[model samples]
Target: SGTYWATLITAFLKTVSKVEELDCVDSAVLVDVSKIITLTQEFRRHYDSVYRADYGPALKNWKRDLSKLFTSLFVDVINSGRIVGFFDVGRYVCEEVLCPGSWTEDHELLNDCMTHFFIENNLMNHFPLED
Candidate 1:
């Protein structure tokens, strides 16, 4: 189905379940969320960097490195048929881990939870819920 960030995120959570065996807490999810948040911000910077070309948004001159890992993850979702055998973890961390699930409630944490869930399932790495 196109790029299901939601499904992709859930699959990621499953992986984390297998990895850590202990569902990752929301706090851990925040760590991952912070990274993507940074990436998104950087992406904007790059968007502007293209035009600016000066020294404003050009923070690192690198967004995500467009690495193989990213590509694999892309296939895992976009082209699920191509994905040989994927995993599915569960919800371990919620905003509650951070602040009664209320304080940590934010797009970043939500996104991070999805990311961490996937990573743990042996999809990528980075705070991946591993065993």
Candidate 2:
């Protein structure tokens, strides 16, 4: 609604879904969790380069808590974005660090996800570029 990290992030995700033909449908699933998961996975998997080794307590344990955090963030987002779409994964980190207004920044991971894909940027020994 307002200009903040979320507006850009949601747009970024939707853009990716649109360009990559992920079936974007506005307020619904413009993008699916699998694509979301795969996109964010790269950021967490390569946090060092993505954020220059600067993930705060909000996502400090992003790697170690993979399964649950992934679920938490994804669910909340899926629900919000759902007729059910939203950045649930991003919010999960908010309560984890108890930072009420930090949920938007939490989605920076996906922010970079879109960047990386557009540039075909690989983090290292990395990538699915040729595809």
Q: Could you estimate the TM-score for every candidate?
A: 0.24, 0.24
Rate residue 126 of model 2 by lDDT.
23
lDDT by candidate, in order shown: 0.32, 0.36
Task: Write one digit per residue (lDDT tens) for candidate 2, span 36-86.
Answer: 545454444444353332335425655443233233323333322221112
Candidate 1 regions exceeding 4 Å error are 1-25, 48-123, 126-131
Off by over 4 Å in 2: 1-31, 49-53, 57-131
Please state the error at residue 58 of candidate 2 in Å.
8.7
TM-score, predicted candidate 1 vs. hidden true structure? 0.24
Model 2 TM-score?
Answer: 0.24
Q: What is the clash tally of candidate 2?
A: 12
